[PDB]
Write a protein that binds this ligand. Structure first.
Ligand SMILES: OB(O)c1csc2ccccc12
Ligand SMILES: OB(O)c1csc2ccccc12
Ligand SMILES: *[B@@](*)([O])C1=[C]SC2=C1[C]=[C][C]=[C]2
Ligand SMILES: *[B@](*)([O])C1=[C]SC2=C1[C]=[C][C]=[C]2
Ligand SMILES: [Ca+2]
Ligand SMILES: [Ca+2]
Ligand SMILES: [Ca+2]
Lengths: 277, 277
């Protein structure tokens, strides 16, 4: 459907309509070129209009993961790579410098195209740029951006998992260990990533997955249910009590809490050896 | 020093220590086998202990993207693939069925190993399972997992972006359009994933990127600043006013607001044609 330009680390997809000199539209927050298509129809008699899906969005696809440092708020990897994508797109489509319009965060991509690859720019428009770096009050706006990201991404996660743990009657030691911040700032970014992945891709999917009581009954002789000695009253123990009630499969108590295997490894092992050694 | 097993779609990494019959530990929310290493030390004289990084975590790596459907909350792709990984690992390390212990969400993986690959299971233990599907009050626990995810992913973003838009004095028409819930359930999932990505990886990095006014004065003759006529008073217009004040680069007014190119594509095009056609 869309056109493709294969670049280092990505397949860049774009829409193309019209005839005449090339005019590249760079999208803002939505990331995709489809938002420009009604506009392109109005221009297609005068320009070859090109509307880009920036490489992290839409029908574009990465061919290798983002660098770990891209999560750093001062990383320049993505904005420069987006600008290089536009410059390479222009060079692929035109032997002459081209017309470029970016809007909002796409206007910032456009500014980096002019800075890094001026040779591809005939004319350029910055539609409502939100860049703050050169403003006299840059700090105020930078701090507002930093704080809203921190509120939505970090604060929301921290507060939600605390109250969720309490509603499930998770023991304090488990709540602390499952939430404990990594000792390194490289580890804390991974940890956020891992926890958000688990929330979006694991908790709902796994806890409501296709296991029935009859699955337990059929292999009852193979199964041990384990409840921690330090996590009594918590929701997972009620799950085991229900399995036991309906199947007769024994519950064995084992030292520690939800994370008892690392809290009390000697005692945890002693029970496993009684079971299976 | 971790071991590796190449499987469909992933390189599965795992710790291996000890001697004796194979005992595989499946981690829960942390996703990684290292949390079992102190326990492994206590068991290594009786078992070949195998502590897995499940394929989406730790030193494991995917070799092809997750299916687009994995973000759906009723997807079963990941749990079934995790169970298949454990069964394939078991077969690679042992000709006999093996001992398996999973904890928390990893106990759910263990349950699916027993259900779909009982032939690899000698004995199995479910440590503090949080699965709710077969519970008499499953709806209660399921809707609560769904709610905690919705609160952290969706509502925190909704509420934050609303306040953010008031700090930036974004026009109501643009606020509504940039936040409008998509018309399909899957479109809403993609929409919030895209905004979360933009918040972590774009807003801070791009708006405080290294652009100076000197970068514009070098090519002042090629640059047009565009202000929407329906977005007066908003922060991006102030950015354009500062650029124009300091550099003399012209501001051209254009129909619509921050999203004017799709709000009023005919009027937007008319101005571009005046500029450049
Ligand atoms: O704080 B966490 O990241 C976490 C992971 S699993 C679980 C279960 C109950 C409460 C919190 C948690
Ligand atoms: O609501 B959004 O997803 C959004 C994207 S950019 C921006 C700027 C101000 C207020 C909201 C937004
Ligand atoms: B355009 O999407 C826009 C208007 S205000 C603001 C942006 C983009 C990033 C930060 C702030
Ligand atoms: B084990 O990490 C645990 C205790 S309560 C709960 C889980 C996992 C998923 C949902 C709830
Ligand atoms: Ca076309
Ligand atoms: Ca470059
Ligand atoms: Ca330059």
């Amino acid at each position: 459907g869309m056109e493709t330009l294969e670049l280092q680390g990505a397949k860049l997809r774009y829409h193309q309509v019209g005839q005449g000199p090339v005019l590249i539209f760079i999208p803002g927050a939505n990331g995709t070129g489809d938002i420009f298509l009604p506009l392109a129809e109005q221009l297609k008699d005068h320009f070859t209009v090109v509307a880009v899906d920036r490489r992290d969005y839409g029908e574009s696809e990465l061919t290798e993961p983002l660098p770990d440092s891209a999560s750093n708020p001062d990383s320049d990897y993505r904005v420069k790579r987006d600008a290089q994508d536009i410059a390479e797109l222009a060079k692929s489509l035109s032997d002459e410098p081209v017309y470029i319009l970016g809007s909002s965060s796409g206007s910032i991509v456009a500014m980096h195209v002019l800075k890094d690859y001026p040779e591809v720019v005939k004319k350029i428009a910055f539609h409502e740029p939100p860049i703050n770096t050169f403003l006299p009050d840059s700090t105020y706006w930078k701090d507002k951006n930093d704080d809203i990201v921190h509120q939505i991404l970090t604060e929301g996660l921290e507060k939600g998992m605390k109250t969720f743990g309490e509603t499930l009657n998770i023991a304090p030691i488990d709540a602390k260990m499952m939430s404990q911040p990594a000792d390194t700032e490289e580890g804390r970014i991974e940890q956020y990533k891992r926890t958000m992945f688990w929330l979006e891709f694991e908790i709902r999917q796994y806890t409501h997955s296709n296991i029935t009581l009859d699955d337990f009954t059929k292999y009852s002789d193979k199964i041990t249910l384990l409840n921690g000695t330090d996590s009594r009253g918590s929701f997972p123990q009620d799950v085991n009590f229900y399995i036991n009630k309906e199947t007769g499969i024994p519950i064995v108590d084992i030292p520690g809490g939800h994370l008892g295997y690392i809290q009390k490894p000697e005692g945890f092992a002693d029970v496993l050896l009684n079971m299976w050694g």
